[PDB]
């Protein structure tokens, strides 16, 4: 359908870091991109829809940017509970997901 | 929702080939012949919808199905007899060069009675092409319109949910001896080009025609050797359960 | 595979599993189907230093996992160690004591 | 014998572009000759004719953009069956 | 207190079929557009299809066309996902998630936009396929 | 900070040996980063494609991983060899540390 390429697979960071995950579409999708967080054994959780707007009740440390083809999710100041897997998904579309990014604790 | 390789040709506006219902199954040919522009539907909304009815993955009549798009209508849905003729000619050329057998052509348009349009249709029918057209939306006698008035083109009028003639603006489906059959043409669900996961409900004799084209395409898969007269006797009998 | 309960084998502490003042011991939860299985230590009162691993799927079609814990070697002869294994799909509950040999000093 | 036709619905008429439709068995080479004859015959009078398209395998004839002034002339061309003024078609 | 609750874990022999349910609960309305999205263990996310009760049709993912049928019981606020010709590769957690059919038509028209914004899941159902 | 694993090796239990099969378990404990190589050698023969592995999710308190590797053999094959060796490469060790045992103390 449309393919989504996510970068990188893996990340190491400490609380207080600014982390940026990046996600790329095989074609233009205006800003029809969603970001999810997933923790072990739970369903994904919606953080950001339409590229840049925050889902209901999600902390403002999370922000999305991007248009056309290249997109970015930024966590501005990483908290202990932000260590998880993140997925991008396009809904332009017929929905399709990135293959994930694991945010791990630096050490 | 109330309503062996064959090739379905559509002559219409441009189409949104990426739409989820038709992407990968609708070959956009590069034929384009349209007049300069002379209000709220998109420039490719009419054809994307009709490609949808007919061949759409989940909303279509012939969920398959193989389609080829030729552009004979501009953004305002306006074409010319001449541009249509050249499009018809493009089809004939590709019939001769790259066959195959069974060929369906959908003509979701109408103009005034045209001797030359009706002739091109006749010539193409002689080669064994299935031609399916709208009867037109003028609450009028279809014999006054082309390609609707052509015998040897399958002319389709529109019925609604209660199997009655469809009412359109202050007009509605055409009628009379020139109409070979009726088919569903009210609030037909199919691909909207507003977005590639959008669906739209549309009314008209285009829709009814698209439906008949879809059924003609499936019948021709199962039995690719039906003669036009056989196909027509089958479609007439099919449109009955009363 | 067909639904099946696991066998629980001891991963006995020894020479060998000892380092500094620490000794590693555990359980081998073997040959069960399907997922999941839960493992805990001393009915819950032992969580510090516990590692319960993801299962692996074997060529046989059955699943196998291990759960280990590190403790002071000083406590080996005195303190008791039981891994509580639950395979809810098969209604298999097993409490396995894990003993060293000798163990002496 | 050569006859002239336009769309019955006035506003749908597209004067200035015409389908010259030739007699039944006219070959593609005879069609090109007729169009060329039209063109030369019109130039001789100070009129541009643009031959937009020559119809091959669907009917014999050609498509020409020219002043309506030359219609009387074009009907006298060899092989002409009838000429039709172009007209509008609409999405239905 | 608005939630989607799925039927429990299954185990199936290769070549058979599974039917997993998804019940909507705790809102004034509970008849919703529902998607199914699967995740094989250790892998990522994969959309299978959706049922759209206003539009009255399902949309299936190309990779699953012919194997999934997705229905909805009109009486019980419950949507079903039935996958057949199971193979080992179908071992996954199957999630349901709600999407939307937004009326975006003007004049109107009558345009239903299927917006795949997965705000609400779906606890997951583990389906294991093994001989 | 980078943190070298603590390797521990486990012979098959006598209960398991009873039932017919043998599992040798190597354990790499509390290391960082995640990358680790684990090489099995039986009587100095490198073993390939008949082991399996699991890694824990990063630790709640000290943010490290732990890995368990399991070598599988038949009782007949196990009782045909003497030296069973678990070799571990990881960027926190100056060179591959080996942990082994001889069958029968
Ligand atoms: Ca007819």
PDB file of N, CA and C in Angstrom, chain C residues 1 3 8 11 71 88 99 101 104:
ATOM      1  N   UNK C   1       0.954 -28.185  18.091  1.00  0.00           N
ATOM      2  CA  UNK C   1       0.998 -28.947  19.359  1.00  0.00           C
ATOM      3  C   UNK C   1      -0.393 -29.048  19.984  1.00  0.00           C
ATOM      4  N   UNK C   3      -2.477 -28.774  23.834  1.00  0.00           N
ATOM      5  CA  UNK C   3      -2.367 -28.191  25.160  1.00  0.00           C
ATOM      6  C   UNK C   3      -1.583 -29.177  26.037  1.00  0.00           C
ATOM      7  N   UNK C   8       8.971 -28.939  35.515  1.00  0.00           N
ATOM      8  CA  UNK C   8       9.816 -27.941  36.158  1.00  0.00           C
ATOM      9  C   UNK C   8      11.047 -28.614  36.741  1.00  0.00           C
ATOM     10  N   UNK C  11      17.375 -25.499  38.591  1.00  0.00           N
ATOM     11  CA  UNK C  11      18.673 -24.994  38.196  1.00  0.00           C
ATOM     12  C   UNK C  11      19.435 -24.754  39.480  1.00  0.00           C
ATOM     13  N   UNK C  71      21.279 -14.624  44.939  1.00  0.00           N
ATOM     14  CA  UNK C  71      21.135 -14.408  46.388  1.00  0.00           C
ATOM     15  C   UNK C  71      22.507 -14.488  47.072  1.00  0.00           C
ATOM     16  N   UNK C  88      -1.810 -21.641  33.378  1.00  0.00           N
ATOM     17  CA  UNK C  88      -3.271 -21.530  33.390  1.00  0.00           C
ATOM     18  C   UNK C  88      -3.996 -22.287  32.256  1.00  0.00           C
ATOM     19  N   UNK C  99      17.378 -27.159  45.609  1.00  0.00           N
ATOM     20  CA  UNK C  99      18.418 -27.475  46.586  1.00  0.00           C
ATOM     21  C   UNK C  99      19.804 -27.540  45.927  1.00  0.00           C
ATOM     22  N   UNK C 101      23.795 -29.268  46.412  1.00  0.00           N
ATOM     23  CA  UNK C 101      24.277 -30.565  46.942  1.00  0.00           C
ATOM     24  C   UNK C 101      24.992 -30.443  48.317  1.00  0.00           C
ATOM     25  N   UNK C 104      28.356 -27.458  51.926  1.00  0.00           N
ATOM     26  CA  UNK C 104      29.202 -27.331  53.135  1.00  0.00           C
ATOM     27  C   UNK C 104      29.452 -25.895  53.703  1.00  0.00           C
TER      28      UNK C 104
END
